[PDB]
Amino acid sequence: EVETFAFQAEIAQLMSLIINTFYSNKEIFLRELISNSSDALDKIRYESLTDPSKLDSGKELHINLIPNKQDRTLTIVDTGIGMTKADLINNLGTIAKSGTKAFMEALQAGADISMIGQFGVGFYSAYLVAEKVTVITKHNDDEQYAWESSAGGSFTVRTDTGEPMGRGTKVILHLKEDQTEYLEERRIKEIVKKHSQFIGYPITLFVEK
Numbered sequence: 001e002v003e004t005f006a007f008q009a010e011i012a013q014l015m016s017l018i019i020n021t022f023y024s025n026k027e028i029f030l031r032e033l034i035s036n037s038s039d040a041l042d043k044i045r046y047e048s049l050t051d052p053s054k055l056d057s058g059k060e061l062h063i064n065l066i067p068n069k070q071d072r073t074l075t076i077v078d079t080g081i082g083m084t085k086a087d088l089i090n091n092l093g094t095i096a097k098s099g100t101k102a103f104m105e106a107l108q109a110g111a112d113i114s115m116i117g118q119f120g121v122g123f124y125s126a127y128l129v130a131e132k133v134t135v136i137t138k139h140n141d142d143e144q145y146a147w148e149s150s151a152g153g154s155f156t157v158r159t160d161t162g163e164p165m166g167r168g169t170k171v172i173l174h175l176k177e178d179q180t181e182y183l184e185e186r187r188i189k190e191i192v193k194k195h196s197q198f199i200g201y202p203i204t205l206f207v208e209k
């Protein structure tokens, strides 16, 4: 069964602001997502110093960027800690409620969208370039899940029966039609070099086809 949930009003409100505001510097979505991956990798690494069996689901700690022009997707893959079902439906949204308010406040004081990450809600910058975001994730403690949202005030969560991923997260960006520059290898390298050059995990940029 696919379950459908409503975003908290404040999140819905943040998402519409990100979709509707005129803001050309969309490219920062990628450093926000890579940074989320790096944090998630830090987390599993740390946890495994006191419980080595936490890496039975995979020793390798890395990030893959995978463009597919045929599907028009850019996928950010990591072997980090993953997210549980409670993370997906409740935990992360509760936390996010306070960062959203603060971010929205800051924007009315002349902050700009690029600073979203300082408020712990940078995930939602995905909606600068994606019409739909699909997140497949597996945490050691839980089953594999798929989250998706096209905004519009709702998201879904289902158990994922696709290919098992071991441990980690895939964020699949279904790009807006005018945002296909982020499928281009030279454009991606440029952004990773500009914004994400000092990440402490290998970042492999996959090419097509």
Ligand SMILES: C#CCCCn1c(Cc2cc(OC)c(OC)c(OC)c2Cl)nc2c(N)ncnc21
Binding pocket: 036, 037, 040, 078, 080, 081, 082, 083, 088, 092, 093, 096, 120, 121, 122, 123, 135, 147, 169, 171
């Ligand atoms: C906020 C924040 C960071 C924690 C959640 N998270 C994120 C960002 C994130 C935040 C969310 O809510 C605030 C969220 O749900 C709406 C979310 O999921 C669909 C993601 Cl991927 N990316 C990763 C990742 N690659 N690996 C592990 N946890 C992640």
